[PDB]
């Protein structure tokens, strides 16, 4: 219910959606993220192998059991309801592993907001089409011992500025002790999705357990009206080994989903006989009907 979830986001800054993935969709997403981040308790990897891998990896991924979820139409509908626009873009997406203390020290982030674009070009607004929506799709069970996300509330609800005197969107413990007294962990079963507005005060946390790792898919979405904000940048060409997965994603996605990647919408001046032709060449089997010029 986009109206219900948007109301939770508006009033408390976050909403936890249980069982966002279930059944085969969940098992497939778990298997896909496990191809990147192993588990020495369950496979033949070691702490040395784990330390040699990067623990955060950007979209697009090697499986559409990960690539499709930031573009899920249930998520898009929530964001459209909250922002009041359909002209949305995926700002970023990455997968992440946080390993237990047997694999090295794990440290907490400071409480912060994510209301800002990366360039800080202009100050954020927390209303209307200027809001940002973040998702964390948990692919392992998350307890207080396994690096839960911590949340407080929307910055304005706490009276704290989006730009602090230190010149960032982060809140030090010495300047903002009351925020740390109010923070709470989000505990969640695998397949749950945490949604939050970017102006919420929140943080990642250290993994306190010795063994295991938390696995999650991250993404965030903005309205194109916030035109100083970048959509997710990646580099790929048809020659690349990862192209086939991305090509297959583009064929699978519906027009409403492709829109978040900056795809030219139906009726856009981009579409001509030649660009329809090259679209079918690059994505064989894609449905060109919504884009055909009159
Ligand atoms: Fe953050």
- Domains in the chain (CATH in brackets) are 2-232 (2.60.120.620), 234-294 (no CATH)
Tokens 């192998």 belong to residue: 49
Question: What's the CA-to-centroid distance between 109 and ligand 1, angstroms?
Answer: 8
Which strand (E) or helix (H) includes residue 29? helix 23-34
| Selection from 126, 103, 112 nearest residue 39 by Cα | 103
**Which DSSP symbol is given to 211?**
S
Cα 203 to the chain's mean position, in Å?
14
Q: At what angle do helices 73-83 and 2-12 cross, to 10 degrees?
A: 50
Question: What's the CA-to-centroid distance between 199 and ligand 1, angstroms?
Answer: 9
| Selection from 211, 228, 264 nearest residue 99 by Cα | 211
Question: What's the CA-to-centroid distance between 183 and ligand 1, angstroms?
Answer: 14
Three-state DSSP at 195 gives strand
Sheet with 133-138: strands ordered across: 14-17, 193-197, 133-138, 213-223, 88-99, 56-58
| Selection from 69, 114, 119 nearest residue 233 by Cα | 119
Question: What's the CA-to-centroid distance between 201 and ligand 1, angstroms?
Answer: 8
Question: What's the CA-to-centroid distance between 149 and ligand 1, angstroms?
Answer: 9
Question: What's the CA-to-centroid distance between 244 and ligand 1, angstroms?
Answer: 32
Resolution in A for the shown PDB structure? 1.4
d(CA 126, CA 280): 40
Question: What's the CA-to-centroid distance between 289 and ligand 1, angstroms?
Answer: 40
Question: What's the CA-to-centroid distance between 266 and ligand 1, angstroms?
Answer: 34
Token pair for 190: 């695998």
Residue 70's contacts (CB-CB under 8 Å, 6 or more residues apart) are 59, 90, 93, 135, 217, 219, 221, 260
């Amino acid at each position: 219910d986009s109206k219900s979830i948007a109301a939770e986001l508006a009033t408390r800054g976050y909403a936890l959606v249980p069982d966002f993935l279930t059944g085969d969709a969940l098992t497939e997403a778990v298997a896909a993220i496990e191809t990147y981040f192993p588990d020495p308790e369950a496979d033949d990897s070691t702490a040395d192998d784990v330390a040699a891998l990067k623990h955060a990896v950007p979209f697009p991924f090697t499986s559409n059991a990960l690539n499709r979820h930031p573009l899920d139409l249930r998520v898009i509908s929530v964001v459209e309801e909250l922002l009041g626009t359909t002209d949305l873009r995926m700002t970023s997406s990455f997968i992440q592993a946080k390993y237990g203390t047997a694999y090295g020290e794990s440290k907490d982030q400071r409480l912060h907001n994510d209301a800002w674009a990366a360039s800080s070009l202009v100050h954020p607004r927390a209303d209307g089409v200027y809001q940002r929506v973040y998702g964390i799709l948990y692919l392992t069970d998350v307890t207080e011992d396994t690096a839960p996300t911590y949340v407080v509330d929307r910055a304005a609800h706490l009276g704290v500025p989006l730009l602090t005197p230190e010149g960032t969107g982060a809140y030090s413990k010495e300047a903002y002790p009351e925020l740390y007294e109010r923070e709470r962990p989000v505990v969640v079963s695998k397949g749950s999705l945490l949604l939050f507005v970017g102006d919420i005060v929140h943080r990642g946390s250290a993994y306190h357990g010795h063994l295991g790792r938390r696995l999650a898919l991250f993404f965030n979405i903005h309205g194109a009206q916030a035109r100083w904000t970048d959509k997710h940048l990646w580099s790929l060409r048809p020659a690349h080994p990862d192209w086939g997965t991305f090509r297959d994603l583009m064929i699978e996605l519906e027009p409403r989903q492709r829109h978040l990647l900056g795809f030219p919408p139906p009726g856009d001046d981009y579409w001509t006989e030649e660009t329809i032709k090259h679209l079918s060449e690059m994505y064989p089997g894609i449905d060109v009907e919504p884009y055909l010029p009159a």
